[PDB]
Amino acid sequence: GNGRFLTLKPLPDSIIQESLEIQQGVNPFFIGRSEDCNCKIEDNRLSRVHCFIFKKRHAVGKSMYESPAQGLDDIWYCHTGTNVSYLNNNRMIQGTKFLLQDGDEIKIIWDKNNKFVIGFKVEINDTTGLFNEGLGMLQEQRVVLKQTAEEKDLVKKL
């Protein structure tokens, strides 16, 4: 990776038709209206910092039965927006985290009446020694995790 690792590109299916790339060097990558966010997406519906993606070192206890990747890094999508975001098929409320597998489509905002729909396609171009870039490691079937003060602190420095 020369600078880019993950590519979040607001696809045509979404009200936004732009492409943003999370530099492997920037952790965590903040997205939202405010330019402060590593990613620039301004939607009156979402907060200046609707959500941010944070990368963490993927690990596990033993390798009994299951075959892990020793100890590589994975990308976690953190949502801090009050309008709640949607990752593929999992709910993302203000204060949640989710595993990002190469080719992850995340919905920042969806309005049935307003027809306001946002969605970015995550595409890992470079693999900075990733357990498997992001194919959806077994064990945990796409489940939404919760964030702690550690996560909230990340945005505090934003």
Binding site: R45, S47, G81, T82, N83, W110, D111
Partner: peptide, 7 residues
């Protein structure tokens, strides 16, 4: 300082 609710 925010009042959002997409329902």
């Amino acid at each position: 300082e925010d009042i959002y609710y997409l329902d």
